[PDB]
Amino acid sequence: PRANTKIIVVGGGGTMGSSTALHLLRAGYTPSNITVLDTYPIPSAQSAGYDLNKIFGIRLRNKPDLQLYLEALDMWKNDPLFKPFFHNVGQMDVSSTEEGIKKLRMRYQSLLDAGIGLEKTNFLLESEDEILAKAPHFTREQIKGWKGLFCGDGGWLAAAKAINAIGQFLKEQGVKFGFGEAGTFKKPLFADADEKTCIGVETVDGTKYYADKVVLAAGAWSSTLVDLEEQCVSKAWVFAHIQLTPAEAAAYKNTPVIYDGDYGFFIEPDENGIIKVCDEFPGFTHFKMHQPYGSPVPKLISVPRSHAKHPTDTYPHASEVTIKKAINRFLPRFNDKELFNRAMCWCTDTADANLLVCEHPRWKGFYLATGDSGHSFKLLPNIGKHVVELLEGRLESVFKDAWRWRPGSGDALKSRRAAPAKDLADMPGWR
Numbered sequence: 178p179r180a181n182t183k184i185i186v187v188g189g190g191g192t193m194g195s196s197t198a199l200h201l202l203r204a205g206y207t208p209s210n211i212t213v214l215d216t217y218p219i220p221s222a223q224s225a226g227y228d229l230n231k232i233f234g235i236r237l238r239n240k241p242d243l244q245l246y247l248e249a250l251d252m253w254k255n256d257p258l259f260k261p262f263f264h265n266v267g268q269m270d271v272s273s274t275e276e277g278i279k280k281l282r283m284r285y286q287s288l289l290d291a292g293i294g295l296e297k298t299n300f301l302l303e304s305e306d307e308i309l310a311k312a313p314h315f316t317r318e319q320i321k322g323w324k325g326l327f328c329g330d331g332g333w334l335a336a337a338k339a340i341n342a343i344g345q346f347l348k349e350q351g352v353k354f355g356f357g358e359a360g361t362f363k364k365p366l367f368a369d370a371d372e373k374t375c376i377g378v379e380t381v382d383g384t385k386y387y388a389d390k391v392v393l394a395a396g397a398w399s400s401t402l403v404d405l406e407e408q409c410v411s412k413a414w415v416f417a418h419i420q421l422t423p424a425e426a427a428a429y430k431n432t433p434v435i436y437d438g439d440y441g442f443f444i445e446p447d448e449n450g451i452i453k454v455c456d457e458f459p460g461f462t463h464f465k466m467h468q469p470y471g472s473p474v475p476k477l478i479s480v481p482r483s484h485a486k487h488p489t490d491t492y493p494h495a496s497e498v499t500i501k502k503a504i505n506r507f508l509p510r511f512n513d514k515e516l517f518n519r520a521m522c523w524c525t526d527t528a529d530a531n532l533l534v535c536e537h538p539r540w541k542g543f544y545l546a547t548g549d550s551g552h553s554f555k556l557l558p559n560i561g562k563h564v565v566e567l568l569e570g571r572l573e574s575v576f577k578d579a580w581r582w583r584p585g586s587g588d589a590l591k592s593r594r595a596a597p598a599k600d601l602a603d604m605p606g607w608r
């Protein structure tokens with residue numbers, strides 16, 4: 178029974194972890210029977226969801242994407258917990274190359290082919306007046322030859338504030354927590370030597386926790402903690418910040434997310450006039466030597482870098498150039514603004530960009546909730562519901578099949594992206 182079942186959530190201070198913790202409580206699980214274990218207190222300061230904002234937008238690259246999007250949209254708009262952090266300003270994809278424009282038109286036609294009537298809230302913009310109509314901060318000279326795709330259900334998400342909102346609820350309900358070395362996963366605990374029955378986890382300080390079921394939602398650290406057999410390759414993307422005065426930020430109030438595949442994107446300034454700018458690239462890996470549990474031999478795994486141990490860290494010099502090019506494209510008036518809060522954000526890719534959400538093949542009672550593939554923060558409100566369904570053996574096949582244990586199903590180093598990720602050991606400047 179739910180009331181008498183104990184669950185351990187590793188990485189419960191992150192996106193998929195806190196979501197799982199939330200839906201356990203909603204399902205009627207006893208709060209004191211739930212134990213969240215994360216290196217950092219929720220919201221985890223090293224979590225990929227520990228950001229000013231993320232983008233919410235429709236994307237149909239896999240079979241479960243449509244239902245996951247519709248589910249999250251419904252909750253981002255109506256759920257009293259998540260609603261205050263969704264800003265529905267829309268999103269616009271632009272391009273001036275013939276291949277980029279070609280790609281816009283195909284993405285638009287892709288939405289139509291779903292047959293649910295997405296053409297009602299998604300429009301192609303073939304004129305310059307149509308573009309300026311939805312994004313008046315551009316100039317007519319700037320957007321000469323641009324074509325646009327406007328998705329109206331889009332917008333951005335107050336990321337860290339949303340995870341923090343879940344955390345406040347968890348603590349207020351009486352969920353037990355473990356931080357620092359007492360919250361840092363080391364290995365699972367087993368009943369016998371055959372290791373076919375998991376009964377808990379041990380942290381790096383030696384502390385042991387016992388429960389009926391364990392959930393591993395360690396994000397980009399998952400493949401370093403347990404042996405995922407190269408199903409997940411962790412990569413880092415980059416962003417920077419610029420600050421506008423209230424008078425400068427005025428022309429961008431309620432502005433749609435602007436995106437161009439050949440440059441990157443930016444989001445409207447927040448409460449403090451801060452604009453974030455990402456670029457567009459396959460990501461950076463960081464292979465460092467590590468022994469994940471389940472592997473008999475120290476493998477070389479892409480491990481996220483610790484900002485705590487490396488304070489001077491920003492990002493490679495190549496990133497500085499591409500971020501400045503993005504700024505020159507979208508916000509040329511601010512080309513003299515200073516960049517600050519340069520940082521790297523870590524995700525983990527699967528081969529087909531589907532999630533990795535499944536019970537461990539051998540470790541019965543041990544479950545995996547990772548494989549975010551750098552596009553899953555949008556699933557914060559609803560992903561935890563399906564993880565619970567997995568634990569109770571009620572996950573529908575459309576999700577269970579795509580999220581299945583699938584080693585040797587392709588190369589996650591390249592994934593669905595344009596190129597294999599380069600490593601930070603070959604990029605100068607970030608250290």
Ligand SMILES: *Cc1cc2c(cc1C)nc1c(=O)[nH]c(=O)nc-1n2C[C@H](O)[C@H](O)[C@H](O)COP(=O)(O)OP(=O)(O)OC[C@H]1O[C@@H](n2cnc3c(N)ncnc32)[C@H](O)[C@@H]1O
Nearest residue numbers: 188191192193215221225232362395396522549553554555
């Ligand atoms: C990097 C990035 C990602 C991103 C994005 C922009 C950037 C720069 N923009 C997005 C967007 O616009 N829209 C969107 O939908 N997603 C976007 N993303 C991706 C998103 O951030 C990730 O997909 C997602 O956040 C990852 O989820 P996950 O739950 O997997 O990740 P996490 O929050 O990092 O969770 C990890 C937690 O695990 C804890 N941890 C790590 N190790 C341990 C150990 N050993 N023991 C206990 N806990 C551990 C971490 O501390 C963290 O709390």
